[PDB]
Design a protein around this ligand. Structure first.
Ligand code: PTY
Lengths: 72, 85
């Protein structure tokens, strides 16, 4: 509450990887880029591909043909 | 422009003609069934053809012996007797 507290940093290390010394990068893993780029491409192609694809199917075609036919 | 206005017609170009697909499907079925009937007919052929010996390659002696029946060792006994005159 009023007191600020203790434990300056949360306990434990994320992914058990020890933090590198200041001023140095994380030294990305040899597969890190090839698999992260794969994930990025998959996410984007699913996001823009499954939605920009035409909504052609048998549900919508049957919907249109049922609306047009029920009137008679 | 923006992303979707281009991804839309990109996907539309990527997709194919369904009329061509249906025509090719019905065609392929037609010629595949015709060829199936042809192979079924072909498997019905017996190993030994009806003619067999009638074939010219399977005689090899009706046109070889006549030109040999004049050599010594194959003549009818009544050939050398009256050949002198
Ligand atoms: C720890 C960080 C994790 C970050 C993950 C993202 C952060 C959000 C976390 C929440 C979890 C989200 C999981 C996706 C839930 C999607 C629910 C809505 C999906 C949906 O029905 O809409 C569809 C959208 O397609 C799409 O575009 C969906 C794209 C989803 C991509 C997910 C890639 C997973 C790949 C796994 C492969 C496994 C293969 C197994 C066979 C198309 O809807 P529509 O039919 O109306 O069409 C529209 C025509 N206008």
């Amino acid at each position: 509450w009023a007191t600020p507290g203790h434990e300056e940093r949360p306990k434990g290390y994320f992914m058990n990887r020890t933090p590198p010394a200041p001023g140095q990068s994380r030294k990305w893993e040899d597969w890190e880029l090839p698999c992260y780029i794969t994930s990025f491409l998959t996410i984007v192609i699913l996001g823009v591909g499954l939605n920009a694809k035409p909504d052609l199917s048998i549900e919508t075609w049957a919907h249109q043909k049922a609306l047009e036919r029920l009137e008679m | 422009g923006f992303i979707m206005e281009f991804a839309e017609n990109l996907v539309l170009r990527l997709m194919e003609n369904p009329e061509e697909r249906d025509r090719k499907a019905r065609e392929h079925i037609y010629e595949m069934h015709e060829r199936c009937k042809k192979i079924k007919e072909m498997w019905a052929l017996p190993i030994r053809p009806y003619g067999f010996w009638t074939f010219e390659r399977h005689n090899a002696q009706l046109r070889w012996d006549p030109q040999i029946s004049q050599v010594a060792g194959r003549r009818d006994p009544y050939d050398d007797l009256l050949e002198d005159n």
